[PDB]
């Protein structure tokens, strides 16, 4: 239903990560990050949707979703940074890179992208201590070189 309303985060992310896209749809990607900051429940819904798309068996779907995540985090909004900086969301990324879960069934391209993003946040947003906690654990388990 919400996917039938072009302005909803659901409809936006379905376009921004559509497996049929021949190339990155920056219009939909930036539109998603923008719509994200319109409502108080926007950020929480965004991470919920992103987490699912990122765990998709269809690589191109997961890759575009990671591009959306990377792009929105690059925006200077505190609310979204804080939502991604919660284990509620970080655990979903851990499941993708961890061999104990989806790691053994996820491409190297996707897993590497997640690790690169996590690292960039540990450097650029040091105040999101939970992100650093998650990253350090991954390096302790041998996930991160």
């Amino acid at each position: 239903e919400p996917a039938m309303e072009p302005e909803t985060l659901e409809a936006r992310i379905n376009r921004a990560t559509n497996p049929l896209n021949k190339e990155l749809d920056w219009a939909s990607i930036n539109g998603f990050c923008e719509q994200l900051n319109e409502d108080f429940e926007g950020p929480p819904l965004a991470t919920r949707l992103l987490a699912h798309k990122i765990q998709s068996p269809q690589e191109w779907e997961a890759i575009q979703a990671l591009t959306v995540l990377e792009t929105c985090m690059k925006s200077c909004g505190k609310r979204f940074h804080d939502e991604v900086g919660k284990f509620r969301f970080l655990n979903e990324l851990i499941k993708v890179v961890s061999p104990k879960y989806l790691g053994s069934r996820t491409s190297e391209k996707v897993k590497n992208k997640i690790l690169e993003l996590l690292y960039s946040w540990t450097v650029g947003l040091p105040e999101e201590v939970k992100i650093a906690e998650a990253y350090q654990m991954l390096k302790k388990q041998g996930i991160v070189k």
Binding site: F87, L90, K95
Partner: peptide
């Protein structure tokens, strides 16, 4: 709120 880290 939030949950615990997944080990």
């Amino acid at each position: 709120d939030d949950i615990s880290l997944l080990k």
